Design a binder for this molecule. Sequence first.
Ligand SMILES: [Ca+2]
Ligand SMILES: [Ca+2]
Lengths: 287, 287
Amino acid sequence: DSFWEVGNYKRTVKRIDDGHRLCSDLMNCLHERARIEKAYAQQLTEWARRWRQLVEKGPQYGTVEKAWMAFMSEAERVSELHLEVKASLMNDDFEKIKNWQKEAFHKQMMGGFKETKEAEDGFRKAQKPWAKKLKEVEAAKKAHHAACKEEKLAISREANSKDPSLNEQLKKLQDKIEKCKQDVLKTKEKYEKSLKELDQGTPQYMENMEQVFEQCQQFEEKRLRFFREVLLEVQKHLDLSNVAGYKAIYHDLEQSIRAADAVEDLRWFRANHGPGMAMNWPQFEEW
Amino acid sequence: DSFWEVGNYKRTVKRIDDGHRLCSDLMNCLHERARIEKAYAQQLTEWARRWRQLVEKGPQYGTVEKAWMAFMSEAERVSELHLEVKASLMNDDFEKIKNWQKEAFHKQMMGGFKETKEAEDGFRKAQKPWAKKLKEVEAAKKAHHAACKEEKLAISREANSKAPSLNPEQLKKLQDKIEKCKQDVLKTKEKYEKSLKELDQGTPQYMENMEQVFEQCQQFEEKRLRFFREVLLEVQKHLDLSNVAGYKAIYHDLEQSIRAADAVEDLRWFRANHGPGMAMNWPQEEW
Ligand SMILES: [Ca+2]
Ligand SMILES: [Ca+2]
């Protein structure tokens, strides 16, 4: 249940497979955002294309037609602006994480990552002496839970011994007890002797596990620091107020709307479609 | 096909209808853009829901998980900002246009708009008078050419050849018919002449009549234009997220969350809970 138990390092070795996994989960996350931005872009271009044709063809004209059109232009700047978020998310961040994942993790010909197997190996190897001593100890204690039982049972047999049927039979009982009692004694010493060695062994074993562990942390710290550095970059690319000309799109929009002059427009109609027009007052044609 | 040509006032009449139509196209335009706006917002919201759960269900925990999640937080906030654009658009703008159209343009029993019929009527009036006399000139343009051509048909037979023609009386009739023809040209010209001189007076008064109604279509049209300009400025402001302090806040905040990412305290937590800093029951048994 705890890290020091044999093989309970399985977790810190898994963190490295998780390490790779997360480089993809993050790429996918960005990748999907990218499509969202380009979709909105696409929609905006479409809208402006649609409405450019409709305003040209329709009956709105003049400086109020200009103001209307202004709006399909701002859609076109916004479209370009979100389109290059896709561009930044994709060309840069995604590829940064992809290249990092190539340089940090390495698939091997018959398995997983070199990294994973290396941590998995240094762990096995720093745990090996001490796990050996452990099996030694457990076997010994079991051989001491065995002698104990048999001795106790020979002793019960003496209880059965106080049967009026016989009595070579008792002597055997006493001798059996003596040896069993003695054998309990030896197995005892063996066991506690092996337990001692395990304790000394343990300070040394403890050193080797931490050596291995602290370079698992190290590698992991690299991935964490990268996530940090890169997410700070991602957020710049998302921020459109980080763009110089964003503000200008709106300033230009405003300017175009302001220009629309109702009167300039009214004077254009009078002269081109109204009373302001040239007329050939009827004349007398001979012939 | 100049304005003054009887009935050419039709093109300025058609300007009204078109006004209502343009109001509608604008409304539609706007609505489409709203629908666009909301679609972005919504795709963001799905992205945030998706990735929040995914990040939560995955192996990144800690302060670095938090940063990634702050990321999910921004999409939603941006979505708020665009649903808000959508609302402004539909709730302010579309409604403004929709109500404006309804107070400028009134159905008339029997179809069409009371204002288009108004203009059609007054033009007609003002012209009616002058299009009578013009119809007269035209018939006197047909009087005069009739006579002239009749004269030109009567010379030729006489010349040919006469080819006899046993009589002289016939030639006399021919000469006389030519004399009738000079009479006709003469008195047809006089009439054409009277009618032409008649129009002229017609003209100054009729012209005054025409400018009177035209100006009255100008005043109506000016309204439309003025209003169009007014609304577009507003639309602009609604669409403008380049000057919204609320938006930049999204990223100040986001960035602060990414900076809160600490790789070290994330790994101080890992060894405490999953590494060497875990408590352990070292072996030390009976029965
Ligand atoms: Ca047009
Ligand atoms: Ca998680």
